[PDB]
């Protein structure tokens, strides 16, 4: 027996995306992380929901959180639109002066327009916050996963500020619209007040509840992946690498299909939307939503890890017998790994290697082969493959039952 093998096989990607901080850029990550979340409903594993979720899916522990973070990004969207003909319908300031009762009526009613969404937000960030997210989502505390750590308390709070003083606002933009709708100088001041709410609404940021309505969406998806996203199931392997406001960097390892895991891709989308919207909500933070935007790069990393082991075979063909792998740890005995018996080929593996190790052989050409993936430190030995010409009943998984042994090859 002849032991082939090597190199330990090591992809790192790295994306580097370069994109602005435009809201409608933002909406469309925090779209895809809540959609192909909602979508797919993947089932999950000091948590709460840890205990119940654990076999069963996310969309029945957090059917209403998704719901509620859909809204919100879906109303920040209808946020962001009509603030987007609001610009170019400010109320300018012959007698031609007609289009100014509409673009008065437009500007107005669109402002009107822009609160009532932002209390369908805020009333869905409480459908959010307020279920098994209660006291996690909110605050930020080696590792920094459970906490949603977005800052939301931050937003909702200023959201808040910012919605009550536009309701202090309300009965004078509410008579600045019937005194507007006589259609067959008292409105010359509702256009610079107008056209100067409005120049407030979709130019301000600490004082706009268009922008801290949508920065409340952003985050809150921020959040909502972090106070969760580490016990979707996903998933050959990859490496998913992520990092945490205070400096720690994690990774995340990952049949797949609808209401049990996500594949691969769909966590790659996920990891990719997550960085970015990280990535610009931390730093340059959200433009104004008159804004063009601002250029800034995410970067986004992967990586897979594999090794195969090959065997072949001098003597006969142990493709109806047993073939085998053995692992010897510095110094000690020879343990078992993986073993592919009789003709029909059955496998059995291992407790360390289940999910992770895999056993297979080409019966023509006599040699029998081990990928290994998810690779770590704990393995790292010597590795034996061991056959066995002689019949058997049981599987045979203990060194002193296999015959034949290869010289053996190191492993790192």
């Known amino acids: 027996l002849v032991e082939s093998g090597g190199g330990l096989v090591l992809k790192t990607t790295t994306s580097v995306i370069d994109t602005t901080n435009d809201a409608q850029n933002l909406l469309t990550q925090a779209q895809t992380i809540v959609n192909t979340l909602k979508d797919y409903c993947p089932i999950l594993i000091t948590p709460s929901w840890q205990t119940a979720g654990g076999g069963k899916n996310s969309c029945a522990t957090f059917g209403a959180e998704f719901s509620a973070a859909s809204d919100m990004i879906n109303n920040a969207q209808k946020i962001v639109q009509e603030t987007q003909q609001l610009s170019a319908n400010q109320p300018k300031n012959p007698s031609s002066l007609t289009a100014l009762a509409q673009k008065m009526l437009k500007n107005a009613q669109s402002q009107a327009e822009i609160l009532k969404l932002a209390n369908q937000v805020e009333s869905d960030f409480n459908k959010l916050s307020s279920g098994h997210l209660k006291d996690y989502i909110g605050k930020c505390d080696k590792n920094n996963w459970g906490n949603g750590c977005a800052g939301v308390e931050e937003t909702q709070s200023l959201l808040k500020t910012s919605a009550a003083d536009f309701n202090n606002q309300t009965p004078q933009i509410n008579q600045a619209q019937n005194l507007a709708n006589t259609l067959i100088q008292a409105i010359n001041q509702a256009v610079n007040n107008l056209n100067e709410r409005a120049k407030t609404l979709a130019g301000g940021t600490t004082n706009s509840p268009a922008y801290q309505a949508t920065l409340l969406a952003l985050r809150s998806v921020l959040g909502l992946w972090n106070s969760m996203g580490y016990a979707v199931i996903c998933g050959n392997q990859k490496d998913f690498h992520y990092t945490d406001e205070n400096g720690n960097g994690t990774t995340i390892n990952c049949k797949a299909d609808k209401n049990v895991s996500l594949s691969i891709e769909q966590y790659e989308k996920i990891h990719e939307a997550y960085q970015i919207l990280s990535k610009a909500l931390k730093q340059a933070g959200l433009a104004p939503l008159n804004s063009k935007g601002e250029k800034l790069e995410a970067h986004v990393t992967t990586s897979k890890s594999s090794l195969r082991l090959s065997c072949a075979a001098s003597?006969?063909?142990?493709?109806?017998?047993?073939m085998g792998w053995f692992r010897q740890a510095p110094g000690k005995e020879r343990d078992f790994v993986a073993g592919?018996?009789?003709?029909?080929?059955?496998?059995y593996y291992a407790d360390s290697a289940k999910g992770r190790f895999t056993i297979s052989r080409d019966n023509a050409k006599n040699t029998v082969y081990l990928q290994m993936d998810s690779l770590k430190p704990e393995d790292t030995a010597v590795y034996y493959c061991?056959?066995?010409?002689?019949?058997?009943?049981?599987?045979?998984?203990?060194?002193?039952?296999?015959?034949?042994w290869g010289q053996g090859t190191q492993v790192t």
């Open positions: 003597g006969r063909t142990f493709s109806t017998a047993a």
């Open positions: 592919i018996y009789w003709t029909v080929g059955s496998t």
């Open positions: 061991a056959a066995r010409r002689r019949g058997f009943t049981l599987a045979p998984t203990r060194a002193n039952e296999y015959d034949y």
